[PDB]
Ligand binder design. Structure first.
Ligand SMILES: Nc1ncnc2c1ncn2[C@@H]1O[C@H](COP(=O)(O)OP(=O)(O)O)[C@@H](O)[C@H]1O
Ligand SMILES: Nc1ncnc2c1ncn2[C@@H]1O[C@H](COP(=O)(O)OP(=O)(O)O)[C@@H](O)[C@H]1O
Ligand SMILES: Nc1ncnc2c1ncn2[C@@H]1O[C@H](COP(=O)(O)OP(=O)(O)O)[C@@H](O)[C@H]1O
Ligand SMILES: Nc1ncnc2c1ncn2[C@@H]1O[C@H](COP(=O)(O)OP(=O)(O)O)[C@@H](O)[C@H]1O
Lengths: 574, 313, 200
């Protein structure tokens, strides 16, 4: 015992004082380790698993079973020692030192006869004192492991087993895999109920059953880069830390778990506040602050986001999938930009992908990256990485007609199952994103024409996968007057940064609207009208030092009766 | 050790195996032939009467869109393993570029990503017993099928690392969409499959199954199935949802179409049930501790019903 | 402190004499860092951000908060030491020297208990000294990082996080991401008003 303490740690003596966390629901895997360790030759189990499924927890549960006395006679009163290979390597300047340390360890194990040995991260065994082709830990342990005189429990990740252990087929032979699978949601709830006491004692808080049910459910549903039960325990522990910080008896409920998840991932899973609820009920109006008209599209996007925020969304599908199809200039991109402005506060959070660049068959690898063995494999996809940066986002596909069918057929899996796989092998979840596809095609008759054109240019699968197909209608005179008002307001807002104010009378706005209406409008025309007749003349006057900073400018009209065409009318900048 | 359910068949397991058509029809309404063929394959595999070289089963599901082709594979995986993530879902919509086939098996030695290996090979090695679903196989080029010609006939696949992966215990399900009253549709689908795919690839598969369209009875049962999801969703918020028979009939009336599949019914439920229910939930019209009885107002049940209204109590 | 001074630099003692720039508007990120460092298991936060957005600035603000004593009782009077991984692997010439230095540093940390490690370029732990017969710093730190007996704050670029740490999921598990986003325009103006005195 005087040798193994320097290079290892006694797990059974750790369970003597209860320093190991209780292990719940691992009866099958612990029993599997028991019944592998009871063999005659090659009695070495390896716990192969994923990161964070409890592989070391299985060994700690075995130590707790040993100290309790549930074990059979072959594992009764057997001290379980975890071996620190870094402690063996450290301080060995001379080959005699390292190999003599390892053989002293083996001699003590064989002499006492009641030490089971535990190697966490077994992939450190392939090369410890030297390379794989010389004397190292693996080359000394292999003869003992093969004839079954040494009881060694390895612990290894699935990827580390594939990469490091499986290349050395000699150590793969001497270890039987014991798969410690990912526990389910109910198993995670039971595990969390097991660990109430320790976290309550450390955090000085109180955790409810609904809090742990919510933690397990939300960790299973939303976080998509970790494995249960580690993420649920992370949420519980971070909520407890939040309460302990905030007080200086606490109570941790599902709201604190939801807030921790919102901080972690950016997905707004919350109990809705009163202000945010009144915002969401009226958010058609907050959209209509920017987007003018198009009541059907605004209403559909409003229903989708309202369904998402109230917890009535299908967990296997995205928040919404939209086809904004219609003539150019109506506001197909503007509704998406206004939605991004509503959801995030800024318009740069809108993950915009232009489909004009995807006009040839080779560019489909841009979205999900290059396959293994090719250039650009390490960087990965452009869309998958952007969505993995923030799970909650608005993903826009601009001018969808320009792309070819391969991108659609790649994104069908996104539209239905809410998943995308990159060439790296990872899976990114699109289940929390709002997918919008803008189209300028087919231009009550407009509805039929657009629907027929979208039927012609698309396969039925893509149109079935889409939640809402919205045909944007043409602009009218009243809403184009409101448009003119909005452009003048934004120009004035730009102008106040230079210590100047701008105003128009009703006549000038009416003249702009009369010079800016046709069935092709928007801001593709009538922003040129502002650019030609208002912005440019103002620039000419300010550069000439006339009507300079400090004076409010009032734009009037001359040679106009207010009803006629106004071709002879002149804008005057007083 | 290997997770392959080779044991003695217990009485409960035997009774469940004889009743697997009923357990699959618990989720898959309609599609009798495909459920039958999947049932025969699984019974053949578990009886011990299976050819060791060939895989357990190899099917190609074809027909209209939204008729349960992916749903049947998900239901089979749910039967065999108890949850749907155990289904190895590899989708051929990502393989329009012929260069991407490496993702199935891996990179050759001397190239970047060689040490990682393939995606399909490693997932099959981790779970030797699995249901491998290739979605939308028509979209990938004919090169990707040449890698699968060996697993369809001999159940072996060689990855870039050189190791051999056994496909002898896996159920391979292809899902295509070629072709899109039943017999001419079946003939057209079979002719499209013969034209698109090489006969040397269509001979190595056990069964070609054509999925039948959805009619009124299975669509009115799917009304029940997909309102069960919303009911279970409301159970988490101390709320219950019940539909009157008029509500079920009206939802089935606005969601049935033979030239499409099962997705317009989901759209009808999303727009006519979930949206107004969400609006009422956020406006606190109904909250926890209350039940919601959805009824139909201004309707008779026989006419098309262009003006009936859904009422929530 | 006789051994950890030879391999790292104290930021609490640096904030004692005010050699660190004042930090403006990063109350949320510092609060999240103190949140993660207050946990029981896996109390290691990693500041994930774009290059130049203030990852080291957040940690310097945390050190200023610690020396000013506005931190909670769990982080009161704790010295924040940055670990110079180059100096750990600097004088070895051999195989057992680096592991000896790392074990001695960890022993000093555990026998003191009031030291928080800070690692610029956290991705450098993987292969932090990898000879034919050597075990890198990641495998030494991982048993301590998993249980929570060692409190480390990492700083990582998003590209460096994706390329290196994501390739080692075992190390990626031990670290809680704290996303330090790019400041807005008003936040930048506030930072400039804070640093105006120093620059004049
Ligand atoms: N059955 C269980 N009972 C209690 N806690 C568990 C159980 N399984 C896992 N855990 C918790 O999850 C974590 C598992 O970590 P682990 O999977 O051993 O890491 P690694 O994969 O790096 O070995 C531990 O912190 C442990 O507290
Ligand atoms: N309803 C609207 N509300 C606000 N701005 C609009 C509206 N319709 C058009 N715009 C203006 O049109 C421009 C966007 O037009 P857009 O719809 O993107 O063209 P396209 O239809 O070719 O995509 C924006 O600069 C915006 O100022
Ligand atoms: N027979 C059925 N029973 C239950 N649900 C069905 C059935 N047929 C289709 N569905 C619905 O259709 C969706 C799956 O359609 P899928 O089989 O993927 O069609 P495709 O493969 O052509 O895209 C599921 O959401 C499911 O609810
Ligand atoms: N809140 C802040 N207050 C003052 N300076 C800041 C703040 N945030 C960032 N900085 C500035 O940003 C720089 C820090 O960049 P840093 O994050 O160390 O780069 P890298 O991410 O490449 O390590 C410092 O020069 C600092 O002056």
């Amino acid at each position: 015992s005087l040798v193994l303490d320097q290079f290892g740690r006694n797990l059974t003596a750790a369970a003597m004082e209860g320093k190991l966390d209780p292990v719940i629901g691992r009866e099958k895997e612990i029993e599997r380790v028991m019944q592998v360790l009871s063999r005659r030759t090659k009695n070495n189990p390896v716990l192969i698993g994923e990161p964070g499924v409890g592989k070391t927890a299985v060994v700690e549960g075995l130590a707790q079973a040993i100290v309790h006395g549930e074990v059979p006679e072959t594992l009764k009163d057997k001290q379980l020692y975890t071996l620190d290979l870094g402690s063996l390597v450290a301080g060995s300047r001379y080959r005699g030192d390292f190999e003599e340390r390892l053989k002293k360890v083996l001699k003590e194990i064989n002499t006492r006869g009641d030490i089971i040995l535990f190697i966490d991260e077994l992939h450190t065994l392939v090369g410890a004192g030297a390379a794989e082709g010389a004397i190292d830990a693996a080359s000394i342990l292999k003869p003992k492991l093969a004839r079954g005189e040494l009881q060694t429990i390895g612990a290894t990740t699935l990827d580390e087993y594939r990469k490091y252990i499986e290349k050395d087929a000699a150590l793969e032979r001497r270890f039987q895999p014991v798969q410690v699978g990912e526990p389910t949601v109910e198993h995670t709830i039971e595990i969390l109920k097991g660990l109430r006491d320790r976290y309550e004692a450390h955090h000085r808080v109180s955790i409810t059953d609904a809090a742990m049910v919510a933690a397990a459910t939300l960790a299973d549903r939303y976080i998509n880069d970790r494995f249960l039960p580690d993420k649920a325990i992370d949420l519980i522990d971070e909520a407890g830390a939040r309460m302990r910080i905030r007080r200086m008896v606490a109570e941790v409920d599902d709201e604190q778990i939801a807030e921790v998840l919102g901080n972690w991932t950016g997905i707004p899973v919350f109990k809705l506040t009163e202000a945010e609820t009144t915002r969401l009920l009226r958010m058609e109006e907050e959209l209509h602050k920017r987007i003018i008209g198009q009541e059907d599209a605004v209403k559909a996007v409003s229903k989708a986001i309202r369904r998402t925020r109230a917890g009535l969304k299908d967990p296997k599908r995205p928040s919404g999938s939209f086809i904004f199809a219609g003539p150019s200039g109506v506001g197909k991109t503007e509704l998406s930009k206004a939605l991004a402005n509503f959801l995030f506060g800024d318009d740069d959070a809108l993950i915009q992908i232009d489909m004009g660049e995807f006009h040839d068959r080779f560019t489909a690898s841009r979205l999900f990256g290059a396959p293994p063995g090719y250039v650009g494999y390490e960087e990965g996809g452009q869309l998958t990485e952007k969505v993995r940066r923030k799970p909650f986002s608005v993903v826009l596909f601009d001018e969808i007609e320009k792309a070819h069918q391969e991108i659609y057929n790649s994104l069908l899996q996104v539209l239905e199952d809410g998943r995308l796989t990159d060439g790296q092998g990872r899976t990114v979840d699109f289940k929390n994103t709002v997918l919008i596809f803008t189209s300028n095609l087919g231009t009550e008759r407009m509805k039929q024409k657009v629907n027929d054109e979208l039927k012609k240019h698309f396969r039925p699968e893509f149109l079935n996968r889409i939640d809402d197909i919205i045909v944007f209608h043409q602009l009218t005179r009243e809403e184009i007057i409101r448009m003119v008002d909005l452009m003048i307001s934004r120009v004035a807002g730009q102008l106040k940064s230079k210590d100047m104010a701008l105003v128009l009378t009703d006549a000038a706005k009416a003249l702009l609207a009369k010079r800016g209406f046709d069935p092709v409008l928007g801001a593709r025309p009538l922003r040129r009208t502002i650019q030609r007749e208002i912005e440019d003349q103002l620039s000419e006057k300010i550069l000439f030092e006339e009507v300079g900073p400090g004076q409010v400018v009032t734009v009037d009209v001359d040679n106009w009766d207010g009803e006629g065409p106004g071709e002879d009318a002149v804008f005057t900048f007083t | 050790w290997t997770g392959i359910p080779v044991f003695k068949l217990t009485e409960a397991e035997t009774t469940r195996l004889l009743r697997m058509e009923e357990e699959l029809h618990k989720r898959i309404i309609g599609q009798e032939d495909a459920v039958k063929a999947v049932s025969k394959a699984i019974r053949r595999t578990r009886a011990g009467l299976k050819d060791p070289k060939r895989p357990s089963g190899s099917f190609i599901f074809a027909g209209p869109s939204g008729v349960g082709k992916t749903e049947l594979s998900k239901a089979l995986a749910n039967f065999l393993f108890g949850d749907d993530d155990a289904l190895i879902q590899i989708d051929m919509g990502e393989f329009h570029d012929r260069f991407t086939a490496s993702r199935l098996f891996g990179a050759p030695p001397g190239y970047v990503g060689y040490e990682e290996g393939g995606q399909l090979t490693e997932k099959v090695r981790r779970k030797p017993f699995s249901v491998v679903l290739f979605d939308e196989i028509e979209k990938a080029h004919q090169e990707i099928y040449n890698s699968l010609l060996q697993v369809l006939e001999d159940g072996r696949l060689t990855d870039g690392q050189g190791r051999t992966v056994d496909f002898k215990n896996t159920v391979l399900i292809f899902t295509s969409n070629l072709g899109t009253d039943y017999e001419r549709m079946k003939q057209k689908v079979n002719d499209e499959l013969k034209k698109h795919f090489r006969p040397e690839f269509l001979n190595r598969i056990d069964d070609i199954i054509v999925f039948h369209q959805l009619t009124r009875e299975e669509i009115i049962r799917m009304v029940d199935l997909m309102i069960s999801r919303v009911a279970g969703q409301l159970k988490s918020k101390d709320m219950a949802l019940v539909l009157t028979d008029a509500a079920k009939a009206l939802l089935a009336k606005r969601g049935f179409d033979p030239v499409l599949g099962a997705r317009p019914l989901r759209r009808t439920i999303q727009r006519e049930i979930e949206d107004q229910l969400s609006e009422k939930i956020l406006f606190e019209e109904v909250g926890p501790g209350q039940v919601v009885t959805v009824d139909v107002d201004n309707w008779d049940g026989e006419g098309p019903g262009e003006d009936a209204v859904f009422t929530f109590t």
